[PDB]
Design a protein around this ligand. Structure first.
Ligand SMILES: Cc1cc2nc3c(=O)[nH]c(=O)nc-3n(C[C@H](O)[C@H](O)[C@H](O)COP(=O)(O)OP(=O)(O)OC[C@H]3O[C@@H](n4cnc5c(N)ncnc54)[C@H](O)[C@@H]3O)c2cc1C
Ligand SMILES: Cc1cc2nc3c(=O)[nH]c(=O)nc-3n(C[C@H](O)[C@H](O)[C@H](O)COP(=O)(O)OP(=O)(O)OC[C@H]3O[C@@H](n4cnc5c(N)ncnc54)[C@H](O)[C@@H]3O)c2cc1C
Ligand SMILES: Cn1c(CCCO)c(CO)c2c1C(=O)C=C(N1CC1)C2=O
Ligand SMILES: Cn1c(CCCO)c(CO)c2c1C(=O)C=C(N1CC1)C2=O
Lengths: 273, 273
């Protein structure tokens, strides 16, 4: 189970609904007996820009600096900047990780994106030998609580912005599942700017009612790494046997693995698949 | 045609392939007679975090600060941070806009994301009344020149990362096209870290050769806003007449508008559709 949760919030105002959402989760998890730790990126004067300054030790190759390799070495020998180290310590402790933020340009706010780049360092958050389902965070669960200005119909299959499921894919699969995370269903609150005071209060309570059994939820579906040949020679491609088996299938496995066929409904929004 | 071009580079090292790619682009356009401006975000020590400080004048509601509204107001009254305004002037002057950068966590670097968040202010870059093809940058053309660590196979339909087209969509559609931009085929250079010196040399040459007739290229396909009911009351949904004619089509219109059907091949990578 999970006695410990980490809530990462990416918003500058104590007056925003996101802040309200953060407080709601905290109070709800605490009442249930969780240990809650927060990462208010803005209140932390958080630096979102990767650079050589993330390494306090001596680079192996100062003339041609390469972040991936350098930050790994830094991780292994113990000389990553003190702030990155402190977030890595929170992640390691946490069972549940809650990412609370407002949608900004079809994605996560620059400051939170930076958090991922500087914190989710190789060896720590992922390895090529243990990708996705076999990643380091496989015993953890992650959820995204997003707020938007645009209504929900704008993000439907016929909505001008298009299918939200496509927007969520890069984040939930690309960042979260890749490191081993079990991604739970996203908490999506559309057009929070056009929501009556009474509705908003219910949203807060709904969020809290959910967090009471958050750990027992069945996570979103992602194609297992067992269906792919996990090696550079093979190109990390889906096993031939698997390709043949799926040719008889109507729907693709996920949004990223739509396989030219149809995408199973709300693959990145609803579980059970 | 276009005489002016702006290149936004999002990389810290001048020894990187990205910097080399940016220099090639510059050289090539200049030889063909273009005015070339650059935004080396790392070199500029660019501030990517949106805050109330992006507004130098008097806010309208300082105690309940809402970025979207306040920032549009500062734009219209002219009290947007000087640095943001300097970048805005670069966009207004450019016909072509090239975005050079390494893929990081299935998206653009945090420093570029922030650049979008702070420079693409309402009214200036977009208006809900002039969405997508009718956006402010409709006479401009934008291109993504991306470098990757993973191989092209990893991002094929049967690769572990799944379709690259899905990763491209939120950026090319949600950010660039939403603002009016005519998005041109991305320049995708895979596993650049595992590419021979000679190969890298030719890559640089093909980019330069491409930039010679870049303006004459037919852009990627996006469903035109004429197909959707552009009004809140309607929820910005596809017109019924249009939904009806598409019922018999086998393919969806694009990645975001797959419509539960089959996404046309390389909708976000190859033009003509
Ligand atoms: C740079 C940028 C890019 C954006 N890009 C997109 C995009 O691509 N797609 C999109 O859809 N949207 C986009 N948006 C809009 C953004 O998603 C919304 O403005 C944001 O989600 C609104 O929520 P908020 O919590 O930040 O703040 P607020 O707008 O303040 O709204 C919260 C509301 O709830 C009220 N409230 C606060 N606390 C409480 C409480 N405890 N109880 C009850 N009510 C409360 C507030 O008074 C307010 O009316 C963008 C915004 C920015 C700044
Ligand atoms: C935080 C982070 C997240 C990442 N996330 C992802 C991800 O989600 N997906 C993914 O696929 N990758 C990812 N990557 C990897 C990244 O995309 C690659 O490391 C990057 O694209 C490599 O290119 P480069 O130009 O930055 O630099 P470099 O690694 O330096 O490589 C350029 C190569 O070309 C050589 N070179 C330089 N200039 C020239 C020239 N003029 N002519 C010929 N050769 C030259 C260099 O010596 C070197 O060997 C991530 C990296 C980081 C740091
Ligand atoms: C800032 N902002 C708001 C909210 C406005 C509330 O005042 C909305 C919702 O329509 C939106 C934005 C914005 O910057 C970009 C939007 N395009 C990418 C999809 C968008 O829909
Ligand atoms: C740093 N890095 C490299 C490059 C390594 C070059 O040796 C690759 C390519 O496999 C990758 C990364 C990285 O940080 C994260 C990756 N996950 C999001 C998909 C990835 O594929």
């Amino acid at each position: 189970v999970g006695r410990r949760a980490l809530i990462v919030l990416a918003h500058s105002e104590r007056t925003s609904f996101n802040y309200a959402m953060k407080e709601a989760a905290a109070a709800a998890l605490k009442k249930k007996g969780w240990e809650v730790v927060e990462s208010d990126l803005y209140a932390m004067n958080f630096n979102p820009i990767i650079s050589r300054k993330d390494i306090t030790g001596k680079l192996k190759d100062p003339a041609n600096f390469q972040y991936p390799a350098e930050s790994v070495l830094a991780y292994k020998e113990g000389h990553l900047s003190p702030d990155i180290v402190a977030e890595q310590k929170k992640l390691e402790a946490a069972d549940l990780v809650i990412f609370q933020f407002p949608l900004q340009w079809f994605g996560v706010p620059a400051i939170l994106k930076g958090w991922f780049e500087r914190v989710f360092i190789g060896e720590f958050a992922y390895t090529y030998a243990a990708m996705y389902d076999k990643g380091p965070f496989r015993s953890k669960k992650a959820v995204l609580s997003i707020t938007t200005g645009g209504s929900g119909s704008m993000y439907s299959l016929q909505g001008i912005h298009g299918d939200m499921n496509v927007i969520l894919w890069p984040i939930q699969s690309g960042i979260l599942h890749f490191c081993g995370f079990q991604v739970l269903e996203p908490q999506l609150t559309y057009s929070i700017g056009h929501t009556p005071a009474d509705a908003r209060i219910q949203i807060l309570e709904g969020w809290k009612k959910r967090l009471e059994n958050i750990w027992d939820e069945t996570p979103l579906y992602f194609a297992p790494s067992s269906l792919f040949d996990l090696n550079f020679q093979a190109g990390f491609l889906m096993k031939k046997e698997v390709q043949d088996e799926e040719k008889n299938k109507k729907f693709g496995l996920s949004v990223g693995h739509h396989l030219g066929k149809s995408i199973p409904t709300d693959n990145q929004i609803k579980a059970r698949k």
